[model samples]
Target: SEYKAGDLVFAKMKGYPHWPARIDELPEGAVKPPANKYPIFFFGTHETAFLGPKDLFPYKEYKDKFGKSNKRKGFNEGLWEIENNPGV
Candidate 1:
């Protein structure tokens, strides 16, 4: 999904504020190492930070932060409904 500033949309990423962002700044057709994988998103506010990636997702599942119920419901990414800013 293409998001612009001032748009309140969930980020498919991880970090504080649920820091789960989609990776966007990486070079197009870039050869990314698996270790280099980081969840990023354009919150329309911040430059974006790391999302926990796959490892963290499962751990969150155990913590009930990412629940089985959530899997089917799908995630809105990182945009919280409370703010239009994504707080960067």
Candidate 2:
């Protein structure tokens, strides 16, 4: 339940859509992040996406369920798989 710096995560950036990223930095002296804001470095990009925890998911979670499109999935439908492959 605690996300930390240097951890791998998945997120949808401004234009990069849903891509994997590494946590760039965390709040000073904080064991967990401060509420919702986060800074991450997207793979193959020089950009940083500052987002909320809700905008990010565990990398393994993303990989495991990213391609199940034929049956019921996620909290409803297509929650795990990205619809139309957003940007990343």
Candidate 3:
């Protein structure tokens, strides 16, 4: 699937758990990866990495056994605020 800038997604790297990330513009002067790969920003870690389409998943698919949504520290705070305050 094609991911647009600012789209939230789950990105998986080898040997690590799936982490929350957002699709973002590539950094200036950085060499673009092969086709089908995109630049993604990790939430809590505030880190960036290139990931292929196959390594990304929709944000909505993240949930715990009790059906609660999950995200990294920084991302979870935003979700909490939104869920608690409907007007926001």
Candidate 4:
């Protein structure tokens, strides 16, 4: 996933709903971050989020009537497509 420094990611901190942010700095090592350990704006900071190497995060998997699975639309796509708008 090479989520490096300067990467932008989506986040949903405790008080501030979800938003996008760029990696201010990359941590020391590849320490496997715990589940939901989205990156914080900085140590001891309230800001936090999940970072992607690029602006694009991976898409969701799609399956057809035949039971096949494929990575098609991701969160961005779902929030982008007009007809497939959520809570429509």
Candidate 5:
């Protein structure tokens, strides 16, 4: 996988807005998810906070607040898609 500990990526967990999260951990070297599940430690938007180091895919194509498709770019950029300057 392209992610590492501390890289921000998308985690599409049920009951959340496809969270733009921080990848705090993974399952050893160059790990990838099986059936969209990989061990990950993810931090939600600052309001929600950390919920992670579990088995889940730290990447996905998620929609923006405008319902536009957005995927991985970088931590800062991705976060901006939802946090700083949304719907842009």
Candidate 6:
């Protein structure tokens, strides 16, 4: 799946729950994979990781499946940007 910068997605890593993340512009020399990889900024923690295309999913699909509440810290600035600026 092709994702643009600031797009919200669910990132799945081995042994971890699907975490909400935002796509970001890849840095120089960041393409270290044989397949397509994206720079993902994880919400709450704001940590970054390079994930393959298959590792991401649309956020809305899995949003309701994860428990009743989002027990994470920090604000989702990416989400806030998208919401405040529609049609971007």
Q: 1-88, model 2: which lDDT tens digit per residue? A: 4577766767665543456566667557745544677776655443565778877877767856543333322312323323322233
Write the number of the candidate with greater TM-score, choosing between 3 and 5: 3
Model 6, stretches more than 4 Å misplaced?
Answer: 26-35, 67-88
Q: Best candidate, TM-score-wise?
A: 3
- lDDT per residue for candidate 4 within 1-88, as digits (tens), equals 4454444334334453233333445357845445434343322232334433332332231111212222433323423421233112
Instruction: TM-score each candidate.
Output: 0.29, 0.55, 0.65, 0.29, 0.34, 0.64
- What C-alpha lDDT do the candidate models reach, one value each? 0.35, 0.56, 0.65, 0.34, 0.44, 0.65
Question: What residue pairs clash in candidate 3, if any at all?
Answer: none
Ranking by TM-score: 3, 6, 2, 5, 4, 1
Candidate 1: give its CA RMSD in angstroms.
Answer: 10.3
lDDT of 1 at 29: 84
TM-score of model 5 (CA atoms):
0.34
User: What lDDT is reached at residue 1 by model 1?
Assistant: 29
Which sections of candidate 4 miss by over 4 Å? 26-39, 42-88
User: What lDDT score is found at residue 60 in candidate 2?
Assistant: 67
lDDT per residue (tens digit) for residues 1-88 in model 3: 5888777777787865666677877768988767788887776556778899888887666634212345446556534432343122
User: For residues 1-74, could you state the per-residue lDDT of candidate 6 as single tens digits?
Assistant: 48777777878778666776778766678764344777887765667788887898877776667312333333
Question: Per-residue lDDT for 23 in model 5?
Answer: 51
